[model samples]
Target chain A: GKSGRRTELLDIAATLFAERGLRATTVRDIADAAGILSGSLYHHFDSKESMVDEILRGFLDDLFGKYREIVASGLDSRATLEALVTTSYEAIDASHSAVAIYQDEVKHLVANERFTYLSELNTEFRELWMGVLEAGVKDGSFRSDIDVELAFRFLRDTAWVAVRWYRPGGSVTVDTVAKQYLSIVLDGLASP
Target chain B: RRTELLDIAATLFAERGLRATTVRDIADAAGILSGSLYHHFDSKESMVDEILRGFLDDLFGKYREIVASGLDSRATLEALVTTSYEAIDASHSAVAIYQDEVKHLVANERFTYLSELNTEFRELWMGVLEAGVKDGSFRSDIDVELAFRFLRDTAWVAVRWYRPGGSVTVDTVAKQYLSIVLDGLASP
Candidate 1:
């Protein structure tokens, strides 16, 4: 029961953090939103930092775990890239607030000691995608002329930036969005 | 001196965001008192207004020039992309502030021009995409709206990491980006 209540408080905190930003949000703000006193909020978490720490860690851990699974699934480079894109959209759909908070605050948050892992996770993310792109190029699965570094940035931006406009349960399903993106990236807008 | 003050404000707005960077912050950064700063500009909003207008006017002027050149759909698209990357290289601080603040700022009546510029920009890009599709230069089945967003986001989002005069030139990035989007990443 305590765990359930803690999860509820964390979700409330994540929404506030995403909407108002980390520094702008206060402990009393979260408490008021949850219909609990600031004292009661502190009983579950020490401070806003602890809540954000847990929120981001939970989101990143789950995302990176999925990435690891996709990487180890033995899919070809192209399929692996597709899977990665789909996983990103799905994450946005399921964890909209967490993704928003991560995007908006990770740059500022990484300055603190508690969020050092944010920077490290970024490095790990780059390496994972770079490996896929390099492999795709080396195996002749991707164009030889492409700048692998730029390609990685293109893929990374195009996928993650969709969170800004994408809303789950909208007219377009995440699956459809991912498929359209894959079609455009893989086949391109140019006519054959 | 006025131009220099605006530049200082733009840099601070880009770095610390519009709300976080106050009038006092700009005045302090420019080595002036808040009263002296207000003597030159009414408020931080005016400074950002000028900064964004300067950037967008220069950019849209280039876009109009490209369109007037009457290049085919494909070439026009390439030129537009090239022009964008060049703008990003030239006025990255203004671009950065626009990217970071335009959404929130547009809610105010004073920043309504930001929304107008955005609509005009969308029409220009969409026209190019539509012409390309009709001419069979671009695939017909792809959604033009989504393609526009993909290209726009990919090009402008580079401001987050792109450092001018860094290891890679804007020209190199533009060409490589065009190569991927136009030709696809798959080896034929």
Candidate 2:
């Protein structure tokens, strides 16, 4: 598959772009990574922008698809929402480079049409979790004062940022990480 | 000469976002010509790439050592957390630079490993948290996923205001966080 090499090039491009930033990552950097000339690199992907578009598209599409499945599964709000979040960790585990790049660079890059879906995905995530949290509050599961909107932001921002320090298979499993996180989110650190 | 020049670049990058910081600025600060700066490095991108990767080299080395120490999961996590706080204390400049510059840096492929490092980090904390949950040493109901995110955020956010020469040390800060986290904030 010609796109196989293209995909490889994009992965290299995405990681570098994420680490050094889009403006800083050069076509030469990607070409050099692929062991080809920069001219040859551009031959496959029209530009760095094209490369990033592919990288982000694949990552986001897979994630959104998984979440849609969880939503469609018709689990209770608690079970459904946990699946949503734990599924996120699974994405982090699988597409870590993309997740880290998204976490680290989404704000700077979001203004571009290429990244418009980033915001859309964010809204989708919020809608999914917020609906559940609000439903829980109404159903007498979550505390009434839980501040669904604020909690939503807290969960979203903080969860993505965990890539900064999270090391899979090192000392903790994602399930355990999920467990402790759930504990805090449900019942905070203050002892009764 | 390279280390000094790199530190100058690092401090500048840390103070000013990487996108705004320039090779000319780095050269000017060193009282050297841009040509001389280029003589040593290809460009500001390469310089910054070196700066950030160098920071991780030492930090990750120390982290892997602790992970291999065979401490029980709880003790192991404490050591890892302590390592992070201590590393941030000494490497505040780098940590700050990394935090501030990540958005910009991630655009470059040289920085792609940072994302890998990010995943590996969560996995590490996840391992410890899971162990504690299973052993019942920690609260069973804890949401390990959300907990790691908050832990990472709270710890790194300290870099915004935390600085060198402060009376409050990283150890103090780490201990306080652990206390808040491990023991409920309510007084007996």
Candidate 3:
């Protein structure tokens, strides 16, 4: 029961952190939303910093785990790249608040020693994408002239930036968005 | 004197963001008293106004020039992208502050011009995209709206990581970006 309550509190904090921003959000604010006293909130988690640390850590761990699985699945480079892109959209849908918080707060959070893993994970994330792009070039899946770094940045920005405008239950589904994005990125806008 | 103060304000606004930056902060960075800073400008808001207005005016001037240059659809598109990277390089701090603050700033009556500028920008981009598609320069099957957003987003968002005088030249970055979006990353 205690663990379940702890999970519930983190979810509430994640929403507040996403909407109000990390610095603007207070421990008491989270407690107020959770219908618990600040002291009780402290009982579960010592501080807001610890709460966010857990929230982001959990989100990145899950995302990287899926990445590792996709890499290990033995798919072709193109298929692997598609899987990675699809997984990112799925993560946005599944973990909207965490993804939003990460996008909004990671810049300042990494300055603290506690959140150094944010930047470290970012490095690993970039390497994983770049490796896939490089492999595609070698295997003739991607064009030989493509700047691997630029392509990686293009894909990374377009995918994550969608979180700003994408609504899960709206007319467009995440699947459709991912498909359209992949089409544009993989196939040039120029007519054949 | 006014120009020098605005430049300092722009740098601080870019670095600390508008809300976090105060008149005193800008003045301190400029090695002057807040009262002296006030003599040049009425408020921090006015400083940001000038900073944004100067950047947007310069940008739209180039945009208009590109559109009026009578280049074909594809060439026009390339020129627009090239001009954007150049603007980003030239007015690095101003562009950064605009991107970071325009949303909130637009809510203020004084900053409504920002919204107007955005509308003009979108129409310019959409027209280029539409004309390209119609003339068979761009793919007919693609969503013009989505493509415009893609090109627009990737072009400006690069300011986040693109530093002037960095290891890579702006021309190199612009050309590489154009190649990917224009030719697709897939092997022919």
Candidate 4:
């Protein structure tokens, strides 16, 4: 634990779990990285199940917290919606661990009482985004043809999935990507 | 020897779900004993962990560098999109594994870095987009939140059909994606 051995081990474990399924990654492997026995590894985490709990908790906590604040903020519904999206992408950028985990395991993760917030958070998040779009339609800020809920799914799946590709240091940026994306979205790619 | 074994394991893991692949299976493929495999790495998790860490770490290092360069929003976004396409070509397997396995793995405390890394990614895009919005380059109504999601999905799902030496390169794919999404694929 002092050397962040536990943390390092978890990192290694997460990678393995991400590449392989959680079940495929073994205790001995994590212990080996921690430079301990499987039993020793167990001392820190009772099972792989517990380790995932902690990982996902970190992701959901910040994500839901940020979203809630954006919704409750004094900004108009659309502004809050924009804020929430920016927040989502920013969160993905910083805490890929949670993003990746959430993407893969929400189905299973939702089962636990400790992790129930995930479903609740998403339900609220859906309402938050949809509420804004609905308001926009009523207020004349958006087109009525769009399916608000589907838009939410599309946005959620796409933004969060960026972790799979988005690389830095080479050339493009998250900002450039975001603007271009928004440009097409807000106004169709007609030469405006 | 270790690297060779890892490659074999990565392939099987990638092809079959990583959980479906076993140390014994990797050992059999490599023509070594499970014991010999142990000698090289403590367990299958170690090998997979290294592979996954290497993929994420390499991508992170590149992203940080791009942010540090401080390019403007549009140019920066192009660069980012370009890199995404390139990565699809450069490391298809890792990307595939990353996509397929992230949820499965992130529940563990070890996977928290996945979340942490994603948050940073979010910040990077928002900074560029907000800057663009401020600069009057993007639509005033441009929703940074929804936009990022579109970009992410556009870049990511490409891995499904994208192969290393395919008929079309990542550049072509990125070009088409960017054009359709950014410039609008519709004919005038």
Candidate 1 lDDT by residue in tens digits, A127-180: 998899999999989989888999998776666777777787898787877887
True contacts kept of 1: 0.72
Candidate 4: where are CA atoms >4 Å away?
A1-191
Q: Candidate 3: misplaced stretches above 4 Å?
A: A1-8, A28-40
List per-prediction Cα lDDT, in the order shown: 0.85, 0.71, 0.83, 0.67
lDDT of 3 by residue, B106-151 (tens): 6789999988987999988888999999999999987676677667
- TM-score for the first chain in candidate 2 comes to 0.89
Evaluating just chain A, the predictions reach TM-scores of 0.95, 0.89, 0.94, 0.82
- For model 2 the local lDDT of residue B156 reads 64
Q: Which ten-residue region of model 1 chain A has the weakest summed lDDT?
A: A102-111
DockQ of all predictions against the true structure, Cα-based: 0.73, 0.13, 0.68, 0.11
Give the per-residue lDDT digits (tens) of candidate 4, residues A91-190: 6567665576676545555557877777777787778777776776677666555545445544555556666565544365666665555557555533
Predicted structure with the largest lDDT when compared to the true one: 1
Point out where model 1 deviates above 4 Å. none
Against the hidden reference, what TM-scores do the models get? 0.94, 0.58, 0.91, 0.52
Best-to-worst order by lDDT is: 1, 3, 2, 4
Per-residue lDDT of B40-91 in model 4, one digit per residue for the tens?
Answer: 8997777778888877788767777887787876667777778777876877
TM-score of each model's B chain?
A: 0.94, 0.91, 0.96, 0.90
Which digits, one per residue and each the tens of the lDDT, describe model 1 over residues B65-153? 88889999989999999999998899999989877555567788988887888788888888899889999999988877778877766
Give per-residue lDDT, candidate 2, residue A71: 83
